Amino acid sequence: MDELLNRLRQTWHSTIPVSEFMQIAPLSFTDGELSVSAPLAPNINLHHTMFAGSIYTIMTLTGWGMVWLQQQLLNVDGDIVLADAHIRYLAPVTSAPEVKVRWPDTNLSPLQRGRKAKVKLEVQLFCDGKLCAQFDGLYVSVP
Amino acid sequence: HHHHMDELLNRLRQTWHSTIPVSEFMQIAPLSFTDGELSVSAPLAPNINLHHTMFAGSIYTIMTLTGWGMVWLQQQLLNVDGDIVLADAHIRYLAPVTSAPEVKVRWPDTNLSPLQRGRKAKVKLEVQLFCDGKLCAQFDGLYVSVP
The CATH number linked to B65 is 3.10.129.10
Q: Which long-range contacts (CB under 8 A, 24 or more apart) does B73-77 make?
A: B73/B8, B73/B12, B73/B33, B73/B38, B74/B107, B74/B110, B74/B112, B75/B112, B75/B115, B75/B145, B76/B8, B76/B11, B77/B8
Question: What residue numbers bound the domain in which B36 lies?
Answer: 1-147
In Å, what resolution does this model reach?
A: 1.7
CA distance B60 to chain A (A): 7
B84 → chain A, closest CA residue:
A46
The structural domain count of chain A equals 1
Quote the CA–CA distance of A84 and A103 in Å, as a whole number.
18
Burial (Cβ within 10 Å: 0-12, 13-18, ≥19) of residue B69:
buried
Method used to determine the 3D structure: X-ray
Q: What are the φ/ψ torsions at residue A99 (nearest 5 degrees)?
A: -105, 120
Nearest CA in chain B to A90: B87
Q: How far is CA A18 from CA A26, A86, B50, B79, in A?
A: 15, 21, 12, 34
Those of residues 27-46 in B touching chain A at CB distance below 8 A are: 45-46
